[model samples]
Target chain A: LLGGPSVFLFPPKPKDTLMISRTPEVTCVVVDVSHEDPEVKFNWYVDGVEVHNAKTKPREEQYNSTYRVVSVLTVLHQDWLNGKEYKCKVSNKALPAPIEKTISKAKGQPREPQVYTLPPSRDELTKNQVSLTCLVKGFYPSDIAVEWESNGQPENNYKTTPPVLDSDGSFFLYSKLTVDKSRWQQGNVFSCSVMHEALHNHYTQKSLSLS
Target chain B: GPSVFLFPPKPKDTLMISRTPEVTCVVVDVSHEDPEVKFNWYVDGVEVHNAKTKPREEQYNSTYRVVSVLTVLHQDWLNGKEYKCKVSNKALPAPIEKTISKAKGQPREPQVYTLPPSRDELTKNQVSLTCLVKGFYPSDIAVEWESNGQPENNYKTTPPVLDSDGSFFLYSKLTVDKSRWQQGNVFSCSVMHEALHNHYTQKSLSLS
Candidate 1:
């Protein structure tokens, strides 16, 4: 008897899409079964078409007389973005009609984000420059923008990393800006502006200055 | 050291960058490994400055490959402006050109043709039903085959190739039982394209 079949997706690579070399993303489904005679077959279907390239790999034997087998399917990133249905079916020789698993995107709720700034510290300026950090968290709907401004002029010298999704169905982000020590010593007004859906005027701003 | 030719290389990767779309230009298989390959981009025939170039990478066969990606704005693409890629290594009398863009004229629907496999192949096993779709614009098309009423999911499809008239064509083939073909079972090649508005037709082997 098969315990469970769970699906996992490994996202496409940036090199796979250098604007020329299209490559498919790999997805795997793992299921646990009895150590002996796990005679099972796995099949994949996309948008109602039976996929022909799906295959099963070796099993990992557990101490509990259980073997974990993995079946893999390669899907195009475009198809995944197109919201195509992926169905994985596992059928056993002894017992049939099989187990079917369809992966679904988790639902999310709208949550207002929290934002603040951590001013540059003395010890952190070891590189002859100061760095400011703006933390944004507790946001749903990952469409957000971070902007930097210095001395009342819009600045473009800041970097924002990809959003880190949290377990509680929210996103976290950090936008950092580093500048020469003299710029911070002169007490130039530095501000980090965050634009998100759940805010007034669709944006929030925080400023930091030594002076 | 060798003459470089630039063609509208079909997108092997994702074409859309969303905020804008990226089109690529490639000059590959350069046996001469001496000098750099210069890439220039033009929009609607006007030379564009500041466009970036990909560094030449040496291949296993002692050749090299270089590419350039041009980022076109949404409105520019929608309004149907030609984007051209030119490559020059000073070996040519003039730079070569290949233009790529969306449709400029009428939306030509696909002309569908279904053919049967050869005699020997049919005797061996299942029939390989070939469906040829030709004369379409924008190159975004899908083909689905159905046996009787059931969808035939296990099939092979080829990438679309550009035609001389700027139209595109594609091929999709499905394998089915020879017995079913002899019995004249109804099969459908349901194609979806901008010009077709979703075309649907039924084709069964006519006892010819």
Candidate 2:
């Protein structure tokens, strides 16, 4: 098998959304699949209720001798909000289990993140350098700002990775800062601040200190 | 009935320019209940896509997947250059506009390298020719084998591999039968990448 099929759910387009605001007309949720098989079927559900009105369109294209099939599903947006949970389940003979993608109200809202600093447990000195680790977790939407500060000023000699998604749809990120052990010993205060949508103007900061 | 809603078009989040400064604006999944969704592409307000029109395919679930691709040079993304893809459907009040711009950075060109420098290896029953392209940005590339100025389609190419420095590396191999190997036959590996516009990097084997 070249690879298992992949699915994506595009956000609602505008004409439907504007109509949704003025009147409770139809809005659509679109699910797209690539590398799909001919026999695969899309089953849509809203809040556990089966939706029979789901429409599907599929096309096949050739790429470097490999055939790629693209399948799309269009569903009513009213049902999406009514159930507060939308699911698209794909069933194919090639898959061991049905592949499911779900979008829920809870996953759309951002949650304030918890921040903490991790310091080395034991005392060891060689290069007189210590690593400051900032762990920020439990936020939604995955877009966040994490920064390091020294004595109330911005610090730049650090690196951070992209937010990692949790199984529950929350996100976490890690940032690391390296500083001279002597500077840390001089009582310099290092801080890690996290900003997310839920926090709005407020940001959470954790300071590093020796015990 | 007046359009109930209008959704803006969605384009890629980030556009990176390679050393060749080539980029593409792809507008994906313009879905509508009707089959008459029309699409147009423009660069800096100038309508293009007359000759470069790609094959547009649609699928049948209640909506349509209308995609438009516009390839452009990186330098054309000036301070105010805008790449736009407009989608119009009967359900839409007006055309849905999605635009993209280049992020500031110079992409690095690929470093092309060939393996087994010795021409003596040609006497073997099967000779393997490999091209190693390293340190390029915007992972899209075309690698092919050419003989006597004719394009040869039979070759295996590896997917683009990401390097530690945010660039990409790719490999392609051509297996040749010893009987078909001629002394004066020119075998070249031609690479088309964003870094090379209107031209390509050609590495040829010379058997003196």
Candidate 3:
């Protein structure tokens, strides 16, 4: 009985497999769901309920990628180099329910200006002129607009200014509003407002009285 | 006189050993030629059940059966136990025996992913979660990307390609509401491996 090395048949191994990796090396954990179904709507929830007043940019514009929504969505914004944990949700009507991913938008260069001046400081003078200056710095929109409110009435006699680019290539912007000193003595509060296209803008107000 | 391996060189599908509570069952159908051969059940090197004179026809769980029930009695057989079932023919020769003890079916341990740290709770917008599963096969395996206990918006399935070494690996990309995630929502990733029957090996991960 001679039995040569008989050939044995084995089942073929499975080929299809699942592979997942992060883009940009998963540095910020931000996921782009813009390619998903359009009917899906993302609602962000924090802890257990929906988040309040959170906004973010879409995935297209680098600036919009960092925008945040409730625990479920990201506005069209970019995260700065130092961006932190921001759970985002992207959903569509096509999906059974909204999905969520907690990620950090890696902090990048801060695109938004930081406003140094707080609001509502009153001033007094013997003259007929009262002025309020709204100072804001380190913001994104290069062009900023200013508005004035005299005695609780919207004033259109406003000024437009160019952003002052610092040595770091960031921005500094401010606006000045002046009212008649007689109006101040008459118990009118003058207010100055700074406006930006950002999701959060400051309309800081300052008042003054004259003797 | 009785002979060793009393049956023609039968396939070594099963063997005999100490009884335990969990078992791995192996079955073979040799009814192709010796239709009259009766199969007997054995446990712990001893016969447990009577041999069947006719081919087995029965139902299991809910499905109707077409073959014999040569179970390893998993619920009763514990670890390190052995099992075997044999078929005999009183007409001419001795019985054929095969048994199985235990199989290496445990899946690899899964990994954990943490949420990105934040400097300020005053932030909101978009969030991201990255799920990674390693040492898995059947790259087509599915993974569940969940958010706040629910499936995330976009669940990306990217299981590892089949390695020649028969290893299993997989990972998925998922994104939820960033503003929500920043506001402190719970996000998680889980892996479900279905390599053998309905049995699954699962790994869960969470981010705060």
Candidate 4:
């Protein structure tokens, strides 16, 4: 008598979702091997009937939701300021049925995220003239803004935004910091930080040096 | 090019990762290149199969049995108890980690389903004839309603609903004309979900 050996992969990928509610929320979902087997493509059948292609959307309000297929889990936030249900539907050419998941607004802190700057184009920059930017992805309360600093003091000249999802499902933000011997030469090292919501006391920072 | 100690990077060798539920039977095969490769299986340390493959033999018990092969199945005596089937191709100086996980239990012997509850008996005309199937997956299940010992395909239907739990419960509802089945009808459900790949698990229950 014999049995098959088992193996589990780490850092699983997120699965597709079907329906989401229009409310404040955060959602997550999982993707598993049994769901995405190359040998047998499975289709999604919801409420007893099969549904075609489906996709999740950004919500209007501040809420959280999550969906798990087998191992992968994806989390999403929908705010009243942006209310809409997020959905995802996935199908493979090999499977007879498609698989889908839906998420609605749930409870969570709605914070106005701030953007900062982006790293100067490392591939092309001279000795004194360089630009950089900082970014944050998948955040609630699009009202968030960003501020830059040097040696314990706030300096102006910057751009910011809440957060946006890339077409490939990743959320990111970027800020640019230009360094030259001209109007600014205080320090080669700078801190790009964000203040949570309106709470000045709650913040995080990333430090980088121009060499 | 200098022969510097550098890590060469490219596409890494990838192996398939697989997992399965517990089950019965034990087959162990020993054909590794390692000359001193040794292996053992323990059901509470009462050794079930020691790895050595020259002649073929079968071990029988009250509820379980095992034959030697390139692999092994159940080995623990937990009574409906599960045990691990492990294989190790020695690692020279030291015995590599002994890999183990939950082993599957013995097969749930298939049973013959009886049609119509024995307690309440009535003629075909008095009630509507229907067939219902519950708790199965991969949808290869079959239900046949026989009239006068002959196969009849006329069936009323209810769409199948799959729950998030993965255990699918479904039913087939059909209204049968009494005159055709009053002489006696056989309502049977057969499962096509295989037992052990090479083997088939078959079950049938008929209500006449």
Docking class of 2: incorrect
Q: What clash pairs does model 1 have? A: none
Candidate 3: lDDT over CA atoms?
A: 0.39
Task: Put down candidate 4 lDDT per residue, A1-211, tens digits, no spaces.
Answer: 1211122222111111111321222222233323223222223332335444333333222122221232222323212223334344444443355555553332354543433333343322434544444544334433344567878887664443224443323333444444564433344667787644333444567665644
Model 1 vs truth, CA RMSD: 31.1
Docking class of 3: incorrect
Per-prediction TM-score of chain B? 0.53, 0.58, 0.37, 0.31
Output the lDDT of residue B177, model 1. Answer: 74
Candidate 4 segments whose C-alpha is farther than 4 A from its true place: A1-118, A166-171, A181-187, A198-201, B1-208
lDDT by residue for model 2 (B72-108), tens: 6544653436767676666677877777664334656
TM value for model 2: 0.37
Give the lowest summed-lDDT range of ten residues in model 2 chain A. Answer: A22-31
DockQ of 3: 0.01
Error of 1 at B207 (Å): 14
**Stretches of candidate 3 above 4 Å error?**
A2-211, B1-34, B50-66, B70-76, B89-93, B103-208
* Candidate 3 global TM-score: 0.25
Ranking by TM-score: 2, 1, 3, 4
TM-score for each prediction? Answer: 0.33, 0.37, 0.25, 0.22
**Fraction of true inter-chain Cα contacts (below 8 Å) kept per model?**
0.00, 0.00, 0.00, 0.00
Off by over 4 Å in 2: A1-211, B1-33, B38-81, B90-96, B100-104, B117-126, B138-140, B181-185, B193-198, B206-208
